[PDB]
Design a protein around this ligand. Structure first.
Ligand SMILES: Cc1cc2nc3c(=O)[nH]c(=O)nc-3n(C[C@H](O)[C@H](O)[C@H](O)COP(=O)(O)O)c2cc1C
Ligand SMILES: Cc1cc2nc3c(=O)[nH]c(=O)nc-3n(C[C@H](O)[C@H](O)[C@H](O)COP(=O)(O)O)c2cc1C
Lengths: 103, 103
């Protein structure tokens, strides 16, 4: 199974759902992450240019894939092959964002 | 806000998340629907041919949009402009399905 994060569309994209795989991968339980922006997964060695590309894509509701250095709850660095896409209604309104970690 | 349902990919797509708009629209709380296939929203005058097109598209992990008759918890019918899409990882594995109601 691949990790999955779902966020609200607006106002800095707080997490509303993580799948079981997310907790296996990151060591974080759902209650520890709901209502937070996913940027808490980043750490000292995270590439700022990669973070900026995610920021611009999410702001514009553009799909993006990045290999980004993330950090488990226990602090272990892991490479996150991250893909983010908007969820739209048929009018084109953004309803949510979905992020997947590909192992 | 538009209604959104997220399901597992496999084994008859049990619901794993519904947004707040889902509960406003349908009258169901998350604890009433999590772990169930979304077909409980259908009822006696739901169009069988429409349900068959949804079944075939989801089985194939193909996006689909239909206008389908659904029923609130209290039994009141509502027209659901429903769009369902797979969520894939970068290997092409289906991680989840997402369903949206367009007002
Ligand atoms: C649905 C979704 C999932 C995300 N998943 C991750 C993730 O797994 N790891 C990560 O470092 N950032 C993730 N992000 C990105 C951060 O939330 C944030 O958008 C990014 O750090 C850029 O914004 P900032 O410069 O304001 O931090 C995700 C964003 C969204 C919308
Ligand atoms: C993510 C997702 C959301 C769904 N949302 C709805 C819905 O809002 N209303 C509905 O009638 N069916 C919905 N369905 C469809 C049913 O779950 C089911 O796939 C459909 O009734 C066809 O299969 P069946 O013939 O086995 O019932 C959804 C399915 C998925 C995967």
């Amino acid at each position: 199974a691949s990790g999955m994060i779902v966020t609200d569309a607006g106002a800095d994209q707080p997490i509303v759902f993580v799948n079981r795989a997310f907790s296996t991968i990151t060591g974080y339980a759902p209650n520890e992450v709901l209502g937070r922006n996913a940027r808490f997964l980043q750490g000292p060695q995270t590439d700022a240019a990669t973070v900026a590309r995610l920021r611009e894509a999410i702001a514009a509701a553009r799909p993006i894939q990045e290999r980004i250095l993330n950090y488990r709850k226990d602090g272990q660095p892991f490479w996150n092959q991250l893909s983010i896409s908007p969820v739209r209604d048929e009018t084109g309104n953004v309803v949510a964002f979905v992020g997947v970690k590909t192992d």
